[PDB]
Scaffold this active site. Structure first.
Site, PDB file in Angstrom:
ATOM      1  N   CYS A   1       0.801  -1.210   0.000  1.00  0.00           N
ATOM      2  CA  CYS A   1       0.000   0.000   0.000  1.00  0.00           C
ATOM      3  C   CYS A   1       0.842   1.271   0.000  1.00  0.00           C
ATOM      4  CB  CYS A   1      -0.970  -0.013   1.189  1.00  0.00           C
ATOM      5  SG  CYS A   1      -0.310   0.600   2.696  1.00  0.00           S
ATOM      6  N   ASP A  59       2.608   2.170   3.313  1.00  0.00           N
ATOM      7  CA  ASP A  59       3.772   1.315   3.562  1.00  0.00           C
ATOM      8  C   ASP A  59       5.009   2.005   3.070  1.00  0.00           C
ATOM      9  OD1 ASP A  59       1.889  -0.568   4.356  1.00  0.00           O
ATOM     10  OD2 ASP A  59       2.210  -1.873   2.546  1.00  0.00           O
ATOM     11  N   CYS A 101      -5.422  -1.110   4.414  1.00  0.00           N
ATOM     12  CA  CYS A 101      -4.657  -0.445   3.379  1.00  0.00           C
ATOM     13  C   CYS A 101      -4.942  -0.910   1.939  1.00  0.00           C
ATOM     14  CB  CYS A 101      -3.151  -0.504   3.710  1.00  0.00           C
ATOM     15  SG  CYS A 101      -2.304  -2.067   4.015  1.00  0.00           S
TER      16      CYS A 101
END
Ligand SMILES: [Br-]
EC number: 4.99.1.2
Length: 208
Positions: A96, A99, A159
Site C-alpha cells: 500500500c 507502507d 490499506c
C-alpha cells in the site's frame, strides 16, 4: 485533519497479535535484501521458537510465500504490486501507499517510490528517507485513508484502500464517488508521511 483515530486503530490492529511489532522490523530488513526469507532464518534472528513466528504470520493471512515456502511478502514484497519501492538498485514492492512512507524509517534506508494515481492513472513518484520526503512529483500528491477495522487482517481491512493520487482535488472527486468506506478521507502525501511518523513512534515504543 484529525488523524488520531487512524493511528490508534492501526496501532491496535497491530498490537492485537502479540509479537507482530517485534517480528516486523527484522523481517522488513531481511526482505529489503531482495531474497526470499526462510521462516527458520527468521526464528533464529528473533531468537524465537518456530511456533511463535508461525502464529504471528498466520494472522497476516496476506503474507506471501514462494514455491519453497519462503516468505516473499509482508508489507514489503518481492512480487509486483502497483507500489514500487526501490532501494539501491533493488526493485521491491509494497502492498500500500502508506507502507512506502513508513518502511524507510523502519529499515533505515532511502527509497525511490513510484506508482500511478488510482483515479487517473497518472504516474507519481517521490523519494522517501527515514526523516523526510523529497522529489515529490507531482508536488500535490495525495493519499487516501480509511478507518482501520478491528478483528481483520490489516491489508484487507485498511490499506487495500490506501492509494496514491495525483492531487488532492483529483482524490477528493474519486472519494466522493465512494461512500461505503468508514472514515474515508484524503490527505496530502506530506500529511500521510506525518501519520506514518507518528505510527512508527508508537510502534517502536511497543517493542521489547
Ligand atoms: Br480526533
Amino acid at each position: 485533519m484529525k488523524l488520531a483515530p487512524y493511528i490508534l486503530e492501526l496501532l491496535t490492529s497491530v498490537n492485537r497479535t502479540n509479537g507482530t511489532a517485534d517480528l516486523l522490523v527484522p523481517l522488513l530488513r531481511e526482505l529489503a535484501k531482495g531474497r526470499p526469507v526462510s521462516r527458520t532464518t527468521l526464528a533464529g534472528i528473533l531468537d524465537w521458537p518456530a511456533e511463535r513466528v508461525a502464529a504471528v504470520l498466520e494472522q497476516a493471512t496476506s503474507t506471501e510465500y514462494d514455491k519453497d515456502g519462503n516468505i516473499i511478502g509482508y508489507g514489503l514484497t518481492l512480487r509486483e504490486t502497483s507500489y514500487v519501492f526501490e532501494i539501491d538498485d533493488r526493485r521491491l514492492y509494497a502492498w500500500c501507499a502508506l507502507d512506502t512512507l513508513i518502511f524507510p524509517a523502519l529499515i533505515g534506508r532511502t527509497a525511490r517510490v513510484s506508482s500511478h494515481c488510482a483515479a487517473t492513472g497518472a504516474p507519481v513518484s517521490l523519494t522517501v528517507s527515514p526523516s523526510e520526503i523529497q522529489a515529490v512529483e507531482p508536488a500535490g500528491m495525495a493519499v487516501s485513508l480509511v478507518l482501520p477495522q478491528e478483528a481483520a487482517d490489516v491489508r484487507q481491512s485498511f490499506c487495500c484502500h490506501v492509494h496514491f493520487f495525483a492531487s488532492v482535488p483529483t482524490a477528493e472527486d474519486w472519494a466522493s464517488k465512494h461512500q461505503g468506506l468508514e472514515g474515508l478521507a484524503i490527505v496530502s502525501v506530506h500529511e500521510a508521511f506525518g501519520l506514518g511518523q507518528e505510527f512508527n513512534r508508537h510502534l517502536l515504543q511497543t517493542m521489547s
